[PDB]
Amino acid sequence: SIFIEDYLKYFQDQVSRENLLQLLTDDEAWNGFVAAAELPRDEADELRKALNKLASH
Amino acid sequence: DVQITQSPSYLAASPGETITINCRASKIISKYLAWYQEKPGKTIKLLIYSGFTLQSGIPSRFSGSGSGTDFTLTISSLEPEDFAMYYCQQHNEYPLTFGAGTKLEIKRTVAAPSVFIFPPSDEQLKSGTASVVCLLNNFYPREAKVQWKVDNALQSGNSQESVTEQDSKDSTYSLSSTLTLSKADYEKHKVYACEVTHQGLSSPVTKSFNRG
Amino acid sequence: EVMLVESGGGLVRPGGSLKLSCTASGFTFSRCAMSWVRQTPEKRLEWVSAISRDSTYTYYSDSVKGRFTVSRDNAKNTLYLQMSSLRSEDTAMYYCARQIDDYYVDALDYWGQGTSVTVSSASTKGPSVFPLAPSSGTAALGCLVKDYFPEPVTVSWNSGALTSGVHTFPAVLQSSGLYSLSSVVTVPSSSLGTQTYICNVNHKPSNTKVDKKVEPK
């Protein structure tokens, strides 16, 4: 969707890889983020797969 | 809101057969669909969640499939304890939405109804109103049409229907239809008739009476 | 053994208020997200509201937003649903249900027995019992239990001594806002005259017990 692409442009241009890896490594932080954003579970899965592809690069 | 289209609404089956309930979503929900069993008296039970994860304690004959948009709940070699009400639900997002339900009923041979008409009582006429009751006793399957006529004028908007649960002994149904009228208009007309249509009857049956 | 008990249900007027409550046991209540689901008289299931593990987030359905408020007390192991501006549309059986803890929104793995709520302008009224007399080798007879409020009414035949052939129909809500119901029994046509048939109608809410003898003519 377009909202996933907005999270992608936001995570690339405004978040450090140390802050992004602290989110992908800590499930407590991740759960707090998706609940705060009110993401449907399928978009939260797509976004986590996308942010893992981006963080490894 | 994600809309869920669950089909069929009714399903007649025999013990030992394999059945499938379908469930379609208005938008993609990945594997996030749950299935519930509701029996009269007991609480609502979770069978499956996340499309195909069987809940602990549930028999292996309950098996869920699908992802994205289309899902199926399959019950293989039906046990007598499985004849119940089943509901699907999406748990991908809030608001949690449900399918309309599927009643899994017991299949038996075709049985035509015995039709009875009952005129209003004099006690009831004395109190300003009039109820004509038309009874269809012990039939199978549930599909039946009941049409009220007053002086050959087809009635509409003034009758109500009530149907029993499938009988525990003989797996049959019964239906009660009441035509409610003002005592004033009950006296305007003469002939009262209910025409019944059911697959067990060769041609439609009429039961009628003359007021007085 | 997980246990969900709901209470506080009853009869309310349109525009009124009511507070449902649900006490939980057999599990650590503070570690779980809870949901409120309701089942309408047409048998449709409808999700109402949900509250998070520690009251941080609340969720409501479109029909209920702005009138209902969900809350919980983890010290007292209770969950609540304050309802207001009640509509006839809110007449349903209300269930507190526990969610699975894999995601903030999830399937409901445990449900309670329910608590009945009825929103209506009508006032408590006992039924009028009329006979459905036979003759028009098996005969059918019964009685019409009409214009009562609220549900339920119980119907037995010959003080429960006549079970076979009896069909008591689900009640129907009329345009008047009062319930109407029928009870019929099929008997051998030879037994008409030699045996008496009486339907014993009981309506606890109006303290009404009636015995109507059904006979031919």
Q: Number of structural domains, chain A?
A: 1
Tell how strand B10-13 and strand B102-106 pair up: parallel
* Four-residue CA torsion sign, B121, B124, B130, B131: negative
Report CA-CA distances (Å) from C177 to A53, A57, B127, C119.
61, 67, 18, 11
Q: Which residues are B133's β-sheet partners?
A: B118, B178
Resolution attained, angstroms: 2.2
Contact yes or no for A42 and B28 at CB 8 A? yes
Return the SS3 of C216: coil
| Best C105, C153, C174, C175 residue to mutate vs chain B (most B CBs within 10 Å) | C105
Residues of A in contact with C56 (CB under 8 A): 35
Tell how strand B114-118 and strand B129-139 pair up: antiparallel
Domains defined along chain B, listed by start: 4-106 (2.60.40.10), 114-210 (2.60.40.10)
C197 in Cβ contact with C185 (< 8 Å): yes
Contact yes or no for B30 and A45 at CB 8 A? yes
B139 in Cβ contact with B112 (< 8 Å): yes
For residues B86 and B101, what is the distance between their CA atoms, to the nearest angstrom? 6
DSSP codes of every residue in chain A = -HHHHHHHHHHHHH--HHHHHHHHH-HHHHHHHHHHHT--HHHHHHHHHHHHHHHH-
Neighbours of chain B (3+ CB pairs under 8 A): A, C
Contact yes or no for B164 and C100 at CB 8 A? no
Chain B residue whose CA is closest to A46: B30
For residues C187 and C173, what is the distance between their CA atoms, to the nearest angstrom? 29
Residues of B in contact with C186 (CB under 8 A): 114, 137
Query: 């949900």: which residue's tokens?
Result: C50
Report CA-CA distances (Å) from C112 to B126, B193, C45, C95, C181.
47, 47, 14, 6, 29
- Determine the straight-line distance between the first and last CA of chain A, rounded to whole angstroms: 22
Q: Which residues are C89's β-sheet partners?
A: none
Residue C114 contacts by C-beta under 8 Å, 6 or more apart in sequence? C6, C39, C93, C94, C95
Tokens found for residue B174 = 């019964």
Query: Is A28 near chain B, with CB under 8 Å?
Result: no
Residues of C in contact with A34 (CB under 8 A): 103-104
Query: Is A22 near chain C, with CB under 8 Å?
Result: no
User: Which residue range(s) make up the domain with A33?
Assistant: 2-56
Phi, psi of A54 (to 5 degrees): -70, -45
Query: Is C57 near chain A, with CB under 8 Å?
Result: yes
Tell how strand B102-106 and strand B85-90 pair up: antiparallel
Query: Is C107 near chain A, with CB under 8 Å?
Result: no
Query: Is C169 near chain A, with CB under 8 Å?
Result: no
Tokens found for residue C33 = 């997200």
Q: Which of C58, C16, A42, C134 is nearest to B133 (CA)?
A: C134
For residues C12 and C121, what is the distance between their CA atoms, to the nearest angstrom? 8
Give CA B12 to chain center in angstroms: 11
Domains defined along chain C, listed by start: 3-120 (2.60.40.10), 129-215 (2.60.40.10)
Return the SS3 of C88: helix
For residues A28 and B131, what is the distance between their CA atoms, to the nearest angstrom? 65
Q: Which of C35, C25, C2, C70 is nearest to B34 (CA)?
A: C35
Helical H segments across chain B, by residue range: 122-126, 183-188
- Determine the straight-line distance between the first and last CA of chain C, rounded to whole angstroms: 58
One-letter amino acid of B68: G
For residues C89 and B113, what is the distance between their CA atoms, to the nearest angstrom? 35
Contact yes or no for C105 and A31 at CB 8 A? no
Residues of C in contact with B124 (CB under 8 A): 128, 130, 144, 146
B23 in Cβ contact with B71 (< 8 Å): yes
For residues C70 and C200, what is the distance between their CA atoms, to the nearest angstrom? 43
Contact yes or no for B92 and A41 at CB 8 A? yes
Chain A residue whose CA is closest to C105: A41
Helical H segments across B34-78, by residue range: none
Buried b (16+ CB within 10 A) or exposed e, C87-104: eeebbbbbbbbbbbeebb
Chain A residue whose CA is closest to B93: A40
